[PDB]
Amino acid sequence: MPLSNFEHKVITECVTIVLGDAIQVAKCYGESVLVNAANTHLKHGGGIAGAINAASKGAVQKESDEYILAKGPLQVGDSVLLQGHSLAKNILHVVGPDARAKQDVSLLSKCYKAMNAYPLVVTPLVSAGIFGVKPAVSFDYLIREAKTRVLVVVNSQDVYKSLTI
Ligand SMILES: NC(=O)c1ccc[n+]([C@@H]2O[C@H](COP(=O)([O-])OP(=O)(O)OC[C@H]3O[C@@H](n4cnc5c(N)ncnc54)[C@H](O)[C@@H]3O)[C@@H](O)[C@H]2O)c1
Incomplete structure (x- = not known):
């Protein structure tokens, strides 16, 4: 019943569109991977990145800064799995x-x-x-x-x- 909390429409057997806050949807699924729409330097200053960071009480930004210091910035199109x-x-x-x-x-x-x-x-x-x-x-x-x-x-x-x- 997690999706019962949200207006949603199934598009295919893979993809469903949901009206609401992606952080709140992900909270309903312990096994979910939540996507952050980030920039090359993982600077989470606003948008969903700022919201994800705030929900993490700043831990996402602290972990992002450690990562970028160690590996350098990302390229457009890249992705990194973090905590x-x-x-x-x-x-x-x-x-x-x-x-x-x-x-x-x-x-x-x-x-x-x-x-x-x-x-x-x-x-x-x-x-x-x-x-x-x-x-x-x-x-x-x-x-x-x-x-x-x-x-x-x-x-x-x-x-x-x-x-x-
Ligand atoms: N004031 C700022 O500095 C500021 C503002 C916005 C974005 N950014 C940065 O832009 C980069 C990403 O830009 P972008 O265009 O890919 O992403 P974005 O987060 O700006 O927007 C992506 C889409 O997701 C929507 N959205 C925002 N919050 C959502 C939420 N909780 N749940 C579901 N949808 C949500 C947005 O309205 C938008 O349609 C990030 O690095 C972010 O830190 C900075």
Whole structure:
């Protein structure tokens, strides 16, 4: 019954769209991997990254800073699996393309392919916020790649209605 707490629509046997807060959806599933829409330096200053960090009481940012100091920054399209900090089994930090910087939007395919390593994924629409890709487009890239159970969570009802109309 976790999804009974949320308005949702099953799109395929893999992909379901959910209206609400991705952090709250992931909290319902102890085995879920929660996707963070991150940047190359894992600086979680706002958006869902800032919300995930706040939910972790700052531990996500502290762990991110340790990682980037040791490994250097990530490339657009990369992903790194880090701790879940009781929000989820793990948090998959994914570096979506920033359309403001005219980065290759097709790198969203590489972002979403990375989700297929995990049996249950809870994800926002990567690059669909400040990175300037329309949610409708980010969704196209997601459904093209998803091979595992993915709960796509959108926190705007206008977006939810648009993707389920
Ligand atoms: N004020 C800031 O500094 C600020 C603000 C936003 C994003 N960022 C940074 O931008 C980068 C990511 O940009 P982006 O466009 O890929 O992602 P984003 O987090 O800006 O937006 C991705 C999509 O998820 C939606 N969303 C936000 N919170 C959600 C939640 N709890 N549950 C479900 N959906 C949610 C957003 O409205 C958007 O449609 C990150 O590094 C983030 O730190 C910084």
